[PDB]
């Protein structure tokens, strides 16, 4: 059905996992999991893109 | 697998699969037309169905009766159709066309009339008659569709055969269904071979320029190609739209009980209101949340300027107060035999309770669902149905309240108990205060009005001509010229010496009908007058112009709906039945008469206007005693309109349906086109509700709660009106919706307002809202997609119809109108594609050779059609908000120039010189093997171009062009500010500019543009072929000059612009995160929340802004001689071309100096344009808020502007502003990146392209 169409059209565009509970941010455990040139860790989904 | 068979490459070409290389789109060219209509109905036979598109269809519409009970002959010897059901019944019917056709000769079974029914009717036999209108209104009715329906059902099936397509946005296919759903294709291939049967013959009509020819099958009807075009329409509505399948279901029911009716035009006439009814006046009965927007209408409430307050959610206390639906809605269901699609309706739209995408969605696919056929009926029909109507006045102006008469006009006395005194004040006091400005006197506004009425269908030259040879003057017949004959510039060019006295009588003549056909309306029928009478018509429309802007200053677009319909504010949709058969003398034009000849009277006591002198008559008016007092010209004018306004109208009739059918009658209709049509009854509507606010409501009602509602709803703050249609902007108190039972109460009234004194206010309050059929709900635009039609072409004459040139422009205009609406654009686009590729060849008879014309798909791709995948790139890589031209085509080349640089290495084509734009890799060798340059250059090849090219003598069109110059002068004075001005011209602005606008080549453009009506056939379209030919072998070097300046331009993006509105409120219907991208441009961008009338007449520089030839053309060629030095006289000498004072114009070329222009101004220097896809969006934010130079990594020192000529600003954000948005997702903010030679050479590079025009 179109309703089910439409909510799962604005889960796609919107509704992307990680709403960042707040830690003290690990090393080990970072967003950016390889920068793939400096192989590094970034924390954030707009610092590693 | 057929057109799999022949567009293995071509199909995924165009579907972001493959490459889209111009040598499969010409091969897909090739099989599109080496084709036939066995092949069209073989392919359609091949694809199975699954279940859920069949439907039963009953036999009952084929075996019909005959005609011959269905006419008959009017007394006066005209053919008339006898009625059966209703006074609306008369149309054509589905029957009895298999014996009225005589085979053609090189073909089998297929043909036209046999000839000696025409000859019986020319000699008068009266079955002959009948059946020679019978065969040619079915002829009009076939006649009303743009090409053949085939190709367009083969563009659906070689679009579709692609499948599902993947979205850059949503990281999925679709999940539309295929070919095995739809019951329009099954249907239609069913209707096809049953009627056909097994005949070898397919195809159950050709479309034809010559005519349409018929299938010789027993079963035959005659209106079966309507029914086609319905089922041929939602066939692409439903895949280029995702309607759902079931209200498609529904909709060809309604379709095919149409055509299984008595006749299929009448039932489609009656039953236009089923689909909003249903489900739009019937919508959100109690929701629980939602949200909507919050506007405000601002304190100027003439300024159409909104401030958008933001997103606000929803409460149940905002549910439909409007009044019930059930009964009248229950009774049209049963009266036509389809209660059980009303049952459904009503079913479903209980159904939906919340404000969100869904619920408006379904809202369009009920709006889309409806049928968009053409009504088509006999002329003589029309003008015996709707002008043989009078109004209803019921409460006259008694004989005693009018005074002793001036000349023939009697006055309203002022202690008059009837309505009709306040309509005397306002126009009074209008025309006073209106004479009173001396604006009115400027004599260059005289020569623009005098040239206003050149326009809108002037015809009946022929009456004029010979009512004025019935009044015995001398006439110039002016020999040997082409198209005159047929023009109203021939008709001012005979009047051009005379005077009025010997002119007052040639106001009397007849009026000739020029017709159209509506979508889902009864044809309308424009009507001219002739020059002298439309000269005389001017004061009206002066005090007209002067309500509609200075007084009542209602209006002459979108967020006015979104206002009006948004919760807490509630609307009336008010309209009339039939404007212009209530506007008569006997209410009306005797008070508008009385009051404009009397309060002109005390500013006018001896001024003269052009043409007319002062005269004298006398009164009764002193009735004690009587005297006789002068005249003055605008009382002279007046006075003549009097007996033609009081007298009634003579209509000749002359269709080409009905053989030999002319007659005249008398009809007391003001007519439909004129200059004083609109504007007056703008006027009146403005007016009438003005007195109902004023006196009417207090005097009618009894409980202070309507009357103290209608206290605070004045004119000035609630009323908006054009012509028919009106509104009411009832305010949202604190406590929310207002109480609907005073509405009603108070709408009830206003249909007494109505029948008392000759009106009929269609009013419907349903808690929705239209304007000028734009539907809105809560905030929301409904796009209606029955008004743009696919298909249908609306040809009110049988005249022979133009060559192949220009339908494919027609194809870009469905284009344009499927992307001003909410369509699915992965699958909108593709079908655009199929469609465009298949109007592309043409397989020409010309002498000795059998020519192709071959368009590639860079002349589409200039206008404005989005390359879907491009040299190896990403697929869906650029929307279709490219502006069609120049600016678009640079701003997805530079988007994606470094990858195509990569393509061009590929397959190297390398030479050594090290070009500023693609570096190592050519473009002369590949872009002519492309031929890039052949489709980019032969776009702007002129398209069906008649020229008159015979050499006419020159002595005969030299006294024309004065003749027409003696027609453009009143005053001399005129002649010596333009005169004056050449002498300066001549002495410094000449030169320089190449091409002077000016207002004596206004004769020579006036000759120009009447001579494009000649139709003529042979020699130049053959010039325009070798023309396409030698365009086509030549080999070019480079782009064009705009183009290559602006190469050098680069740029750069990086952050995507904060949103503009919330995304979780329905702006448009059709566009939602599923139609990804126009949705996320319209929330990145922004709506453009202003009427744009506004906002584009702040940009033209002159005031007015009118003069009849392009003040576009004025305002850009003063900015193009400002930017080139040219000293201030120079600047004088060109306005002095238009010759205003000299003084104000010497002031106004001073003025332009100076001052900084507007962005918008600029684009005009450079013949830029704002394209149409645009004013949906506001635009103005992203030009001068966003798009930018200094870009964040700083000053470049290439990155500079001279200080001198800083026009390159403007130029520089609209190029910016292009690449920043020709590309999907959001309009992301962008920077520059270097020009490469710095702002002098490139503005130098300019100048040297404004060298020449």
């Known amino acids: 059905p179109m309703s089910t169409r439409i909510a799962e059209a604005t889960s796609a565009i919107v509704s992307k996992h990680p709403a960042r509970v707040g830690l003290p941010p690990t090393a080990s455990s970072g967003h950016g999991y390889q920068c793939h040139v400096c192989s590094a860790v970034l924390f954030s989904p707009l610092d590693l893109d | ?1253």
């Not at chain 2, 029909?381 to 005693?400: A, D, G, M, N, W």
């Not at chain 2, 509700?689 to 103290?708: A, K």
């Not at chain 2, 584009?1096 to 009118?1106: C, E, S």
Request: hydrophobic share 40%.
């Open chain 2, 1 to 1253: 697998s057929m057109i799999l068979t022949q567009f293995g490459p071509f199909i995924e070409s165009i579907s972001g699969i493959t490459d889209q290389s111009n040598d499969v789109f010409e091969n897909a060219a090739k099989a599109f037309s080496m084709f036939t209509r066995s092949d069209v109905y073989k392919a359609l036979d091949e694809i199975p169905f699954s279940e859920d598109a069949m439907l039963p269809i009953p036999p009952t519409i084929y075996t019909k009766p005959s005609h011959d009970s269905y006419y008959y002959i009017d007394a006066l010897n005209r053919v008339r159709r006898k009625t059966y059901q209703g006074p609306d019944d008369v149309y054509v019917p589905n029957c009895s066309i298999v014996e009225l056709l005589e085979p053609h000769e090189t073909l089998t079974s297929y043909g036209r009339l046999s000839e000696a029914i025409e000859n019986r009717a020319k000699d008068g036999d009266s079955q002959a008659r009948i059946a020679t209108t019978y065969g040619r209104i079915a002829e009009s009715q076939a006649r009303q569709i743009k090409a053949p329906l085939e190709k367009f059902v083969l563009a659906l099936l070689v679009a579709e055969a692609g499948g599902s397509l993947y979205d850059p946005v949503l990281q999925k296919y679709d999940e539309i269904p295929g070919l095995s759903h739809n019951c329009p294709l099954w249907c239609f291939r069913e209707i096809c071979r049953h009627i056909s049967g097994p005949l070898p013959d397919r195809a159950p009509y050709l479309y034809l320029s010559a005519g349409v020819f018929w299938l010789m099958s027993p079963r035959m009807t005659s209106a079966i190609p309507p029914l086609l075009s319905d089922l041929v329409n939602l066939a692409i509505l439903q895949q280029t739209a995702g309607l759902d399948p079931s209200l498609v279901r529904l909709g060809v029911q309604i379709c095919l009980h149409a055509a299984a009716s008595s006749s299929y035009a009448w039932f489609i006439l009656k039953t236009k209101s089923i689909f909003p009814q249903n489900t739009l006046h019937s919508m959100y009965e109690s929701l629980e949340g939602g949200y909507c927007p919050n506007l405000e209408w601002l304190e100027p409430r003439s300024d159409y300027k909104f401030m958008y307050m933001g997103a606000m959610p929803l409460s149940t206390k905002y549910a439909r107060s409007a009044p019930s639906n059930d009964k009248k809605a229950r009774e049209l269901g049963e009266k036509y035999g389809l209660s059980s699609v009303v049952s459904e309706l009503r079913r479903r739209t209980k159904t939906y309770s919340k404000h969100d995408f869904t619920s408006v969605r379904y809202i369009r696919d009920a709006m889309a669902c409806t049928s968009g056929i053409f009504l088509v009926r006999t002329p003589t029909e029309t003008v015996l149905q709707e002008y043989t109507q009078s109004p209803e006045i019921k409460v006259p102006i008694p004989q005693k309240d009018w005074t002793g008469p001036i000349g023939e006009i009697r006055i309203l006395k002022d202690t008059t108990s009837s309505i009709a005194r306040y309509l005397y004040r306002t126009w009074y006091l209008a025309a006073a205060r209106m004479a009173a400005q001396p604006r009115t006197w400027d004599p260059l506004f005289q020569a623009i009005m005098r040239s206003q009425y050149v326009t809108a269908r002037g015809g009946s030259g022929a009456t004029l001509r010979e009512s004025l040879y019935a009044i015995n003057v001398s006439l110039p017949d002016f020999k040997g010229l082409p198209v005159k004959a047929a023009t109203k510039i021939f008709q001012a060019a005979q009047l051009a010496n005379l005077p009025f006295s010997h002119t007052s009588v040639a106001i009397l003549a007849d009026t000739s009908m020029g017709l159209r056909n509506q979508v889902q309306r009864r044809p309308r029928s424009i009507m001219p007058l002739n020059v002298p009478q439309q000269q005389v018509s001017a004061p009206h429309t002066l005090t007209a112009d002067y309500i509609n802007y200075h007084m009542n200053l209602s209006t002459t677009v979108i967020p006015l709906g979104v206002y009006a319909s948004s919760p807490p504010n509630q609307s009336i949709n008010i309209d009339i039945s039939a404007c212009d058969a209530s506007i008569t003398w006997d209410f009306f034009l005797s008070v508008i008469m009385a009051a404009i000849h009397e309060g002109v009277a005390s500013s006018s006591i001896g001024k003269p206007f052009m043409g007319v002198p002062a005269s004298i008559v006398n009164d009764e008016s002193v009735v004690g005693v009587r005297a006789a007092r002068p005249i003055s010209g605008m009382q002279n004018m007046i006075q003549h309109l009097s007996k033609l306004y009081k007298r009634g109208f003579s209509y000749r009739v002359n269709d080409s349906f009905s053989p030999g059918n002319d007659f005249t009658h008398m009809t007391t209709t003001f007519p439909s086109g004129s200059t004083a049509t609109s504007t007056e009854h703008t006027a009146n509507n403005s007016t009438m509700m003005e007195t109902f606010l004023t006196v009417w409501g207090p005097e009618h009602t009894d409980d202070p709660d309507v009357l103290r509602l209608m206290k605070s709803l004045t004119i000035q703050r609630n009323y908006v009106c054009q012509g028919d249609d009106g509104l009411m902007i009832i305010d949202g108190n604190t406590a929310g919706k207002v109480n609907s039972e005073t509405i009603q109460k108070m709408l009830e009234l206003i249909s007494k307002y109505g029948e008392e004194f000759g009106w009929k206010y269609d009013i419907a309050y349903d808690g929705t809202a239209e304007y000028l059929k734009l539907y809105f709900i809560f905030g929301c635009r409904i796009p209606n997609l029955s008004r743009h039609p696919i298909v249908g072409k609306e040809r009110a004459n049988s005249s022979a119809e133009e060559p192949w040139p220009a339908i494919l422009d027609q194809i870009m205009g469905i284009f344009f109108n499927g992307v001003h609406d909410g369509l699915q654009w992965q699958r909108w686009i593709r079908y655009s594609w199929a469609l465009c590729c298949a109007f592309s060849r043409q397989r020409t008879m010309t002498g000795e050779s059998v020519g192709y014309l071959q368009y590639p798909m860079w002349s589409f791709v200039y206008w404005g059609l989005p390359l879907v995948k491009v040299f190896g790139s990403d697929p869906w890589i650029f929307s279709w908000y490219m502006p069609t031209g120049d600016l678009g085509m640079y701003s997805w080349i530079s988007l994606i120039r470094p990858l195509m640089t990569r393509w061009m290495v590929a397959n190297g084509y390398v030479t050594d010189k090290c070009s500023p734009v693609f570096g190592n890799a050519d473009y002369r060798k590949c872009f002519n093997e492309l031929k890039l340059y052949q489709g980019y250059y032969m776009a702007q090849l002129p398209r069906n171009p008649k020229k008159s090219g015979r050499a006419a003598p020159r002595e005969v069109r030299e006294q024309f062009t004065q003749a027409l110059s003696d027609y453009l002068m009143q005053n001399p004075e005129l002649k010596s500010r333009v005169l004056r001005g050449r002498s300066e011209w001549e002495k410094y602005g000449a030169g320089i500019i190449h091409n002077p606008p000016s207002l004596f080549d206004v004769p020579h453009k006036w000759y120009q543009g009447a001579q494009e009506a000649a139709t003529a056939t042979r020699e130049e379209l053959a010039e325009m072929d070798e023309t396409l030919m030698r365009a086509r072998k030549h080999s070019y070097s480079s782009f064009s000059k705009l183009l290559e300046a602006y190469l050098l331009v680069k740029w750069r993006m990086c952050e995507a612009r904060e949103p503009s509105v919330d995304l979780r409120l329905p702006l448009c219907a059709g566009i939602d995160p599923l139609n990804s991208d126009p949705f996320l441009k319209m929330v990145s961008v922004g709506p453009m929340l202003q009427s744009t009338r506004k906002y584009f007449a702040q940009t033209l520089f002159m005031a007015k802004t009118v003069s009849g030839l392009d003040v576009n053309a004025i305002d850009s060629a003063l900015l193009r001689l400002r930017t080139l030095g040219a000293d201030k006289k120079a600047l004088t000498a060109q306005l002095l071309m238009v010759g205003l004072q000299e003084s104000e114009a010497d002031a106004l070329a001073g003025k332009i100096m100076l001052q900084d222009v507007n962005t918008v101004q600029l684009a005009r220097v450079v013949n830029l344009a704002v394209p149409d896809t645009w004013m949906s969006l506001d635009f103005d934010t992203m030009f001068k808020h966003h798009v930018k130079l200094l870009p964040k990594d700083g000053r470049h020192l290439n990155t500079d502007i001279p200080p001198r000529m800083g026009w390159l600003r403007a130029i520089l954000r609209f190029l910016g502003a292009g690449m920043a948005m020709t590309a999907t997702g959001v309009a992301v903010d962008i920077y520059l990146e270097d020009i490469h030679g710095g702002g002098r050479s490139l503005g130098q590079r300019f100048m040297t392209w404004m060298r020449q025009e």
